[PDB]
Write a protein that binds this ligand. Structure first.
Ligand SMILES: Nc1nc2c(ncn2[C@@H]2O[C@H](COP(=O)(O)OP(=O)(O)O)[C@@H](O)[C@H]2O)c(=O)[nH]1
Ligand SMILES: [Mg+2]
Length: 411
């Protein structure tokens, strides 16, 4: 029925990660949105840090682009669809919004925006692994990762980034492109507007001090500061102020808007567009290929097989995963091209085509669609690629078959 948060990936108590593929397919494989280039916005962070709360206002904005006052009526309590849904009942894992959002970039492109909520605990390793895995995945998939910290970017906050740098540096060498898109530090209750101002301007001078290496204090947090900037195309920071005390000292805050502090609402109002304004949306791209919702479904499947058991994958294994998904996505794109181009000539209905003619069109469009497959960059390497080549040839042969059926409907 109506939209709500659907728990697509969950961490099992046995330390294994189960991905509800079916729900993922309902959402991203729907015909309306399947073929759209995709923006994947994820918020990740500790439990009980104001994530859902924020993500509300992200929905309020998405369902109300037109409004100047999407934030809502001040004398009315906050209402609308809710990420908090059933109160937690909190478990490490990833939630996505049941409704994908369709939006036009300034250049007329109709993109799909996917909202991810990433919940995990960050305290004990047997509990960090899962979190760092959920975090890994979350970041791997997302085009935009907003990292939701409480009061400051702390060393332990920067620690969870360690897992990427190893994999980044590796991916970077093999692809010759930086591996991740945008990472955003969202500092939650900033209390030094006199040291750095709230919002992006100020958030950025803050992040520059915090990320600068060689307090001499840091240890192998040096390694992260050293390489963090090479792994991410862009890294930014937003200083968000305290919601006021009615919001902080209450669970499932049911108050009216006026209850929320003014400077929190002031700044919340620039923040959300900042992240999800049409100009600000960043299309997910791996290797320099833009990714399709269908395409994105491949990367889920691939990365999930990797994080099985307590042991975490080595960059090398992750890398190989990215190769699978990257290769698969090329198949779908090339097969889509063949399929859609064939549909004109063969016809959704009409008109008649002589058997030998269908033959000659098919194999040229098959050879040429295979060429496009070869054209796209492949993570793994030709040898690794070649197994997928066959798959594409085989998937096209079965599409050919289906098209002789249709063709052979002219008496
Ligand atoms: N101190 C503080 N508390 C907040 C903020 N935003 C929300 N809260 C409150 O903190 C509690 C946890 O927020 P919640 O939405 O459940 O975040 P989540 O549990 O991480 O998804 C809720 O009762 C909120 O009412 C914030 O920016 N600062
Ligand atoms: Mg949440």
């Amino acid at each position: 029925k109506k939209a709500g948060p659907v728990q697509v990936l969950i961490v099992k108590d046995d330390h294994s990660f189960e991905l509800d593929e079916t729900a993922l397919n309902r959402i991203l494989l729907s015909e309306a949105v399947r073929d759209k280039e995709v923006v994947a916005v994820s918020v990740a962070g500790a439990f009980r840090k104001g994530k859902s709360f924020l993500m509300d206002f992200m929905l309020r904005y998405m369902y109300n682009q037109e409004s100047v006052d999407w934030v809502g009526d001040y004398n009315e309590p906050l209402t609308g669809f809710s990420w908090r849904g059933g109160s937690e009942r909190e478990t490490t894992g990833i939630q996505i919004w049941s409704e994908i959002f369709l939006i036009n970039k300034p250049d007329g492109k109709k993109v799909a925006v996917l909202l991810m909520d990433t919940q995990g605990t960050f305290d004990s390793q047997s509990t960090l692994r899962d979190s760092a895995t959920v975090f890994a995945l979350s970041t791997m998939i997302s085009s935009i990762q907003v990292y939701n910290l409480s009061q400051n970017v702390q060393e332990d906050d920067l620690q969870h980034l360690q897992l990427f740098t190893e994999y980044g540096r590796l991916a970077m060498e093999e692809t010759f492109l930086k591996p991740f898109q945008s990472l955003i530090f969202l500092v939650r209750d900033w209390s030094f507007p006199y040291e750095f101002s709230y919002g992006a301007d100020g958030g950025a001078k803050f992040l520059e001090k915090r990320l600068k290496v060689s307090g001499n204090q840091h240890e192998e947090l040096q390694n992260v500061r050293k390489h963090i900037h090479s792994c991410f195309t862009n890294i930014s920071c937003f200083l968000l102020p305290h919601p006021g005390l009615k919001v902080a000292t209450n669970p499932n805050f049911d108050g009216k808007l006026k209850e929320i502090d003014d400077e929190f609402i002031k700044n919340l109002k620039i923040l959300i567009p900042w992240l999800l304004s049409p100009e600000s949306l960043d299309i997910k791209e791996i290797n320099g290929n833009k990714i399709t919702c269908r395409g994105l479904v491949e990367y889920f499947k691939a990365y999930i097989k990797i994080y099985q058991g307590e042991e975490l994958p080595h960059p090398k294994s992750m890398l190989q995963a990215t190769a699978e998904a990257n290769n698969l996505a090329a198949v779908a794109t090339a097969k889509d091209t063949y399929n859609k181009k064939m549909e004109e000539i063969c016809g959704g209905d009409k008109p008649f085509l002589a058997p030998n003619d269908l033959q000659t069109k098919h194999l040229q469009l098959k050879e040429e669609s295979v060429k496009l497959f070869r054209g796209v960059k492949k993570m793994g390497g030709e040898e690794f690629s070649r197994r997928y080549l066959q798959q594409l040839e085989s998937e096209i042969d079965e599409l050919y078959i289906q098209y002789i059926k249709h063709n052979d409907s002219k008496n």
